[PDB]
RNA sequence: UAAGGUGAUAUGAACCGUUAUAACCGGCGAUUUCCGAAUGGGGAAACCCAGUGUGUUUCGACACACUAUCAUUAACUGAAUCCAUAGGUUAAUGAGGCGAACCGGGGGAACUGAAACAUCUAAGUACCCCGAGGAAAAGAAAUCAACCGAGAUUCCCCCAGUAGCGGCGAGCGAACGGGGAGCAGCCCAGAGCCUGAAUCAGUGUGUGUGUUAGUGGAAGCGUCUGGAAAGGCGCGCGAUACAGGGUGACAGCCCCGUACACAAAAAUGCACAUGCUGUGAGCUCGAUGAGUAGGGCGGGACACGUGGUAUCCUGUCUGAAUAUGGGGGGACCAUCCUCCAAGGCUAAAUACUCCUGACUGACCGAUAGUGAACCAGUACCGUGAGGGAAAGGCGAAAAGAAC
RNA sequence: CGAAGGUGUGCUGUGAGGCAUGCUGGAGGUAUCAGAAGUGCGAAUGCUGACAUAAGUAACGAUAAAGCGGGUGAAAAGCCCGCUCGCCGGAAGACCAAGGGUUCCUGUCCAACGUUAAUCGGGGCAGGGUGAGUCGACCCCUAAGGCGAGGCCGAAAGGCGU
């Protein structure tokens, strides 16, 4: 199981952009996650007709360690940690910090 | 889809099978002369005539 | 005679090219590309059947794939058949 | 191959020695014979390539006992 | 000058090629060296 | 088991899925072209050509099945030749081929050493060949010992480089006895008492106990330097978890794990319980392996090179006694002691690693370590057997440089 | 707040050496006392890789031979078109078998390949192209020779052969 998944909401623990936030867009298979605003990036773009139109330059989201993301409570308005136990029959992710199911 | 046809008859999905390959063949040509722009579909008739031949090939045993 | 599931395999594509169009339009003849293992009878058939139209003789050859490279690897594309395809006096397709 | 079809008797390997004891290999052979042995009790001859010690155990055991021994172990005549 | 390589395709095949080296206990000794070795190509058998 | 998926270089395009028929992981099924033992015949491997059925047809054709050889058994049939016999046909059953080492057996070198070389050595080694099993082989004394006794086979440590053998040269080299590992004994050569009674074995049954997917799995913050903190400084917490790995520099508490505790719809391993299916236990009296033991001649094996040479195997020619008997105790004889050959079967201690899992290293770190860290038995060389390389590192992130 | 490694300078011991520090480098290094070695290289006509020398030297592969005008092009002695000149003509022409296997045709490119340049190519890249009752294979039949059911023979492997 997952501990953090798309649409999550997040924030950042390491790097260029420690301490803000943002939502989770989608989770590659090597352990990295996209996450809306965060890993900005300026990638120099060619021309080409059929597909992106033009030349021009391009901010993106590069893809970041999901180990340096935490789930984020909005209760205690902290980083957190997640859980795993059965609320009746379904497993569920609970924070430990205040064991509420999310 | 399985279960959808894992009941009708033996002559029921014989009849399946053919108008299925009918359908393949057909895909072919229009794909082969660039008037197939769902690539996909070609794809899932050949999965389609896999899941009859295996129905039949239990019933018939 | 010949069961119409075989039927269904052995034409495979139209073969487009200058040499086809020609054919098509003075020789009255369609340029398929077929299956392997299809003997003339079986395409004379499966033709007849799957387009509705009238078929004179069929003449087939076989084409060998060209090798080739791919950054210092050797390739070699697959041989294939080539059926020409005349049709009887008036039809179109 | 050269072996006895009632004793087994094979060809074997050894030396000659000479005089200075020089050893050069060699074989020793049985002394083998296709022989006509009757028998009585079913009315016929039958050939076996044999040794003359094959030979004694015939005339001692009689050939029925033998024909018994070869058709246990399967080996024709 | 001529050379000793004069190549003929159906008398490599009579000496060299898959069948013959099967019709001997030596020749399949041959084929299950290389195998062993893990000879992409046994015999000349194109 | 799940919110993500459609294997890689490798994007892109079309789509699929998000509470369960998306993908993925494991169990049981299905499909499985052609060549290859290759097996219908042939053949220059991956191709050429058939015969017989049974079914179908649009009368052009079509689909499927079967058809090798040998061995054994059965039926049917059957020459010279009267009965027969050889032969012929059909069926059933089995085999064939491949594979790393280990094991048993059929063959069996030379270089070399002897400071030359022939006896001797190297060596029953290399190599070729046949057969086998998870191990094989060996195995319940015609064995030793010394007048006291021991008690099947196998393996380890000693005895001991001893006693001997030896162109007495070079070299070869025991045993008796002792200490350990492991331990087990039975059956036929035959008839009555007499049974489904010993328990080896086959097939179902439950129950345990493994295996093949998996589930849960503790506890950290601030602040300095810095591109980035896991580092420094400060103050806390977990520990049956500080094995290990990953994360923008070195993390018990960020992630994956780890200690520990849980799990199987289905298949299967081993052990008890066990019906049943073949199976014979016990007791009495008898019997107890002949071209064999021994011998002559020629060789071979024994540490032992024919020697004063016992013992073993037999190519060749011979040939007993048979329990009032026979074998051995290292020429041979006598006395004494010990055993019972010429019929079988037997677990454990012992050998090995093609392969599967886990873990380890005062082993290597790209001229090293496998030939091969990289699409390597490849490229290339050769008629062929066969020979056989070179070649690893952008960055934390492609942000791989628009204009 | 800069490890190993590289490259300087300064100091220091009788020697193999040691210490300090600038620049480069960007993550490792190891006091002391013990322990173990794949422990020290200039030579082996040593082994592998790299780079010199001769030297911008020999040579550019038949002594059948070229000259000019136009074209295209960044560029033309060599490519295209034209006129002339030359050489082969029982071949230096044409068609085949064997052997090779896309070298064939069109478009496109000039890095490497072509003993020079190259707009050209048997070179790179992409696309096209091989149509049979009568031609050949396959097929029917045999030669030398090969395999060979039973068979005969041989320690095994195998050898002969109906
Ligand atoms: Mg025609
Ligand atoms: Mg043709
Ligand atoms: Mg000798
Ligand atoms: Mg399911
Ligand atoms: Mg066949
Ligand atoms: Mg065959
Ligand atoms: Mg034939
Ligand atoms: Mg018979
Ligand atoms: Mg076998
Ligand atoms: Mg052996
Ligand atoms: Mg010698
Ligand atoms: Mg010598
Ligand atoms: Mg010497
Ligand atoms: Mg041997
Ligand atoms: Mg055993
Ligand atoms: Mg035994
Ligand atoms: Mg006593
Ligand atoms: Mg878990
Ligand atoms: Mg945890
Ligand atoms: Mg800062
Ligand atoms: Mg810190
Ligand atoms: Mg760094
Ligand atoms: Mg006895
Ligand atoms: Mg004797
Ligand atoms: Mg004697
Ligand atoms: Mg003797
Ligand atoms: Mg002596
Ligand atoms: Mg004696
Ligand atoms: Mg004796
Ligand atoms: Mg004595
Ligand atoms: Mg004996
Ligand atoms: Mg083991
Ligand atoms: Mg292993
Ligand atoms: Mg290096
Ligand atoms: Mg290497
Ligand atoms: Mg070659
Ligand atoms: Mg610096
Ligand atoms: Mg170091
Ligand atoms: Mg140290
Ligand atoms: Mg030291
Ligand atoms: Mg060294
Ligand atoms: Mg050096
Ligand atoms: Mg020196
Ligand atoms: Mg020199
Ligand atoms: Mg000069
Ligand atoms: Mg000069
Ligand atoms: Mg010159
Ligand atoms: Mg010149
Ligand atoms: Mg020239
Ligand atoms: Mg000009
Ligand atoms: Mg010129
Ligand atoms: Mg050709
Ligand atoms: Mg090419
Ligand atoms: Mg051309
Ligand atoms: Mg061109
Ligand atoms: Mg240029
Ligand atoms: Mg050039
Ligand atoms: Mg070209
Ligand atoms: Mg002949
Ligand atoms: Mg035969
Ligand atoms: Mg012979
Ligand atoms: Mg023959």
Not at chain 2, 22 to 47: C, P, Y
Not at chain 3, 45 to 54: G, H, M, N, T, Y
Not at chain 4, 49 to 71: F, N, P, Q, W, Y
Request: net charge positive; proline share 2%; charged share 35%.
């Amino acid at each position: 199981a997952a501990k953090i998944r798309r649409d999550d909401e997040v924030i950042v623990l390491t790097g260029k952009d420690k301490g803000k936030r943002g939502k989770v867009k989608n989770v590659l298979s090597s352990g990295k996650v996209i996450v809306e605003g965060i890993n900005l990036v300026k990638k120099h773009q060619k021309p080409v007709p059929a597909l992106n139109q033009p030349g021009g330059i391009v901010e993106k989201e590069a893809a970041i360690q999901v180990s340096n993301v935490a789930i984020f409570n909005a209760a205690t308005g902290k980083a957190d940690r997640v859980g795993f136990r059965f609320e009746d029959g379904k497993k569920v992710r609970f924070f430990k910090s205040n064991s509420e199911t999310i | 889809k399985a279960k959808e046809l894992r009941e009708k008859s033996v002559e029921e999905l014989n009849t399946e099978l053919l108008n299925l390959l009918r359908e393949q063949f057909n895909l072919r040509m229009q794909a082969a002369s660039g008037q197939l722009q769902q690539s996909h579909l070609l794809k899932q008739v050949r999965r389609d005539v896999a899941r009859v031949k295996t129905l039949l090939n239990e019933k018939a045993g | 005679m010949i069961r119409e599931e075989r039927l269904l395999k052995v034409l495979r594509a139209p073969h487009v090219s200058e040499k086809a169009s020609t054919a098509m339009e003075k020789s009255n003849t369609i340029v398929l590309k077929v299956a392997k293992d299809a003997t003339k009878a079986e395409i004379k058939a499966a033709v007849q059947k799957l387009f509705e139209v009238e078929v004179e003789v069929v003449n087939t050859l076989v084409v060998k794939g060209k090798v080739k490279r791919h950054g210092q690897r050797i390739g070699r594309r697959s041989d294939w058949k080539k059926a020409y395809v005349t049709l009887k006096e008036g039809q179109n397709l | 191959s050269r072996v006895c079809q009632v004793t087994g008797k094979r060809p074997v390997t050894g030396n000659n020695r000479s005089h200075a004891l020089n050893a050069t290999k060699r074989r020793f052979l049985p002394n083998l014979h296709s022989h006509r042995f009757w028998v009585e009790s079913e009315k016929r001859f039958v050939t076996l390539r044999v040794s003359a010690k094959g030979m004694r155990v015939i005339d001692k055991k009689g050939i029925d006992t033998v024909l018994a021994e070869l058709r246990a172990r399967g080996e024709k005549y | 000058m001529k050379r000793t390589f004069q190549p003929s395709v159906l008398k490599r095949n009579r000496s060299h090629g898959f069948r013959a080296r099967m019709a001997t206990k030596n020749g399949r000794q041959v084929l299950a060296r290389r195998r062993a070795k893990g000879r992409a190509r046994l015999t000349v058998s194109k």
